[PDB]
Amino acid sequence: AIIKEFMRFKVHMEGTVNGHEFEIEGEGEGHPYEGFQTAKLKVTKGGPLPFAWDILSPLSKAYVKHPADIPDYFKLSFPEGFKWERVMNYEDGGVVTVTQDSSLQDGEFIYKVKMRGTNFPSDGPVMQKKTMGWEASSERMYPEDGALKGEIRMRLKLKDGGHYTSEVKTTYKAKKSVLLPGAYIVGIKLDITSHNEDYTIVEQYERSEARHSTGGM
């Protein structure tokens, strides 16, 4: 009754990437029990961004479809919600660090995101805007030290046909005691469905579903 079959969200992000300061404000909506969501984002400070939008898109776990037999840590955390901290280590030394708060206010999810990105090479695909969206990912979720930890090897498509990899670690922490699942996998596909000419208005789509592992966690 706390999380309805349809839920909206608002997101505010503040960040710096290689020293470039920016802010994003957005609104999203989706069906949390179906693993479907969309969002429309606006760059409100620092636009147009001089780097690939794709590094920001993975910066909304309440909208993961969980089978009944896998406890849903994220949904169970509400109304209080949860928080997360993440490091994304890109293969060329680029690094993004993130904090996030997820709350429920006035019947919608509220996401506050703070991030810092550094060491993206000036001639690399992020600063040269040569990326073309993320391949589908498998986030391996593990209960550890009283939290849920996620690990991902993520692959960003490049305009030239190759891929640019990021090793991701996240700690997700509920704001109250919640039943922890065993270790499991969240399958994720995120698309940038539309954008204006300078990526100051961007729309995203994401589908996510939890599953049991088959081969070793």
Author numbering: 6 to 64, 69 to 226
Text from the published report:
Monomeric PSmOrange2 has been developed as an improved version of PSmOrange with faster and more efficient photoswitching. Analogously to PSmOrange, in PSmOrange2, position 64 is occupied by Leu pointing out at the importance of a hydrophobic residue in this position. Replacement of aromatic F65 with aliphatic I65 and decrease of the light energy required for photoswitching imply that I65 facilitates backbone cleavage and decreases the activation barrier of photoconversion. In conformation “A”, the side chain of S217 is oriented away from E215 and forms a H-bond with the main chain carbonyl of Y72. This makes E215 move away from the chromophore, causes break of a H-bond between Oε2 atom of E215 and N2 atom of the chromophore (4.4 Å), and provides formation of a new H-bond between the side chains of E215 and Q42. In conformation “B”, S217 points towards E215, forming a strong H-bond (2.6 Å) with its side chain and pushing E215 closer to the chromophore, facilitating H-bonding between E215 and nitrogen of imidazolinone ring (3.1 Å) that connects it with the protein matrix.
LSSmOrange and PSmOrange have been engineered from mOrange and PSmOrange2 has been engineered from PSmOrange using directed molecular evolution. Electron density maps show that LSSmOrange, PSmOrange, and PSmOrange2 have the same chromophore structures as parental mOrange. It consists of p-hydroxyphenyl, imidazolinone, and 2-hydroxy-dihydrooxazole rings.
